Design a protein around this ligand. Structure first.
Ligand SMILES: NCC[C@H](O)C(=O)N[C@@H]1C[C@H](N)[C@@H](O[C@H]2O[C@H](CN)[C@@H](O)[C@H](O)[C@H]2O)[C@H](O)[C@H]1O[C@H]1O[C@H](CO)[C@@H](O)[C@H](N)[C@H]1O
Ligand SMILES: Nc1nc2c(ncn2[C@@H]2O[C@H](COP(=O)(O)OP(=O)(O)NP(=O)(O)O)[C@@H](O)[C@H]2O)c(=O)[nH]1
Ligand SMILES: [Cl-]
Ligand SMILES: [Mg+2]
Ligand SMILES: [Mg+2]
Length: 298
């Protein structure tokens, strides 16, 4: 563990001239990134060359747009340090203090505390979804079209070596993709990874901050409800997302659920595709196995 930290301490001090690292520890990690807490005060998100090429660039542009344009008491990252190159990206900002929302914590809250948190969330999403996004119009994401392109990449690579059961799962998804209407609604700026491990609470169990707008863009309004609607051990549950949808208002709940259900069905294929693009066999295997788990669950 000691070695990662030394290397990143060196890089931080090297690229940010007057910055002195008195302490540094690993605070989280993704498949291709590592985040560090520095001087018990700064978060530094870091990445070495992936399929970002412009990964931390977009994320930084989104923080800069949001810090200019949001009116909210909810805190988000405000970038003070950035280094962006092809081979290395680093973003630093002051750590937002608080406690991440979990299902356990939620279950200890009174009904009223739960209501007020749901309202805070609905309010934040209403404010962000309502922004005029002209000044960030580069950050458009078309999920349907992305899936089509990923399907083509599958066809060009490993599709012919998949099993019949795997192929059928994929084709059955594509048929559903082609029949759905859930990509034809309102587009807006969405966080696009809006799960409870990105939501911070203050000492009264109210929403105090939101992190990791790394996947944000102009996309279907339904996107920001995918995790709030998810029924799993990591998320609070379907009722939570429904109530939030009612508070948010002017949105078709049944289509939001259809959108989540389609995204969930896509997951094993998304996983396979990630493995192909990043040359990681392990993801290809995991996604294929998951197709069997889902096929046999009923
Ligand atoms: N950054 C590390 C965060 C941690 O690894 C994590 O929570 N990682 C995430 C764990 C989730 N169980 C995965 O699945 C999530 O999304 C699926 C659809 N996208 C849902 O059907 C699923 O029900 C949900 O659970 C999710 O895809 C993982 O997301 C991570 O990988 C995605 C690529 O697939 C990226 O796009 C995300 N930015 C990143 O958070
Ligand atoms: N308390 C607190 N924790 C934070 C803050 N920013 C980051 N973290 C912590 O660091 C972890 C990683 O941050 P995050 O932005 O989600 O990055 P990532 O998802 O691992 N990487 P990427 O977004 O490049 O794929 C978070 O899960 C959380 O543990 C912050 O402002 N406050
Ligand atoms: Cl495999
Ligand atoms: Mg994250
Ligand atoms: Mg992220």
């Amino acid at each position: 563990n000691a070695t990662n930290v030394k290397a990143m301490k060196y890089l931080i001090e090297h690229y940010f001239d007057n910055f002195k690292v008195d302490s540094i520890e690993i605070i989280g990690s993704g498949y291709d990134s590592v985040a560090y807490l520095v001087n018990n005060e700064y978060i530094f998100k870091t990445k070495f060359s992936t399929n970002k090429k412009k990964g931390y660039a977009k994320e930084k542009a989104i923080y800069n747009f949001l810090n200019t344009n949001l009116e909210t008491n909810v805190k988000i990252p405000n970038i003070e340090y950035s280094y962006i190159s092809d081979e290395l990206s680093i973003l630093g900002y002051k750590e937002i203090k608080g406690t991440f929302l979990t299902p356990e914590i939620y279950s200890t809250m009174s009904e009223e505390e739960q209501n007020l948190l749901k309202r805070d969330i609905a309010s934040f999403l209403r404010q962000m979804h309502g922004l005029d996004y002209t000044d960030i119009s580069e950050c458009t994401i078309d999920n349907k079209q992305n899936v089509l392109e990923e399907y083509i990449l599958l066809r060009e690579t490993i599709y012919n070596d998949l099993t019949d059961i795997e192929k059928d799962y994929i084709e059955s998804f594509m048929e559903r993709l082609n029949a759905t209407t859930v990509f034809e609604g309102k587009k807006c700026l969405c966080h696009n990874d809006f799960s409870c491990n990105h939501l911070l609470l203050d000492g009264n169990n109210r929403l105090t901050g939101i992190i990791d707008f790394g996947d944000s863009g102009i996309i279907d309004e339904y996107c920001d409800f995918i995790y709030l609607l998810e029924d799993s051990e990591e998320e609070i549950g379907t009722n939570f997302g429904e109530d939030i949808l009612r508070m948010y208002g002017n949105i078709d709940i049944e289509k939001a659920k259809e959108y989540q259900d389609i995204v969930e069905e896509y997951y094993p294929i998304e996983t396979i595709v990630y493995g192909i693009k990043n040359i990681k066999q392990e993801f290809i295997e995991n996604g294929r196995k998951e197709i069997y788990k889902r096929t046999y669950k009923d």
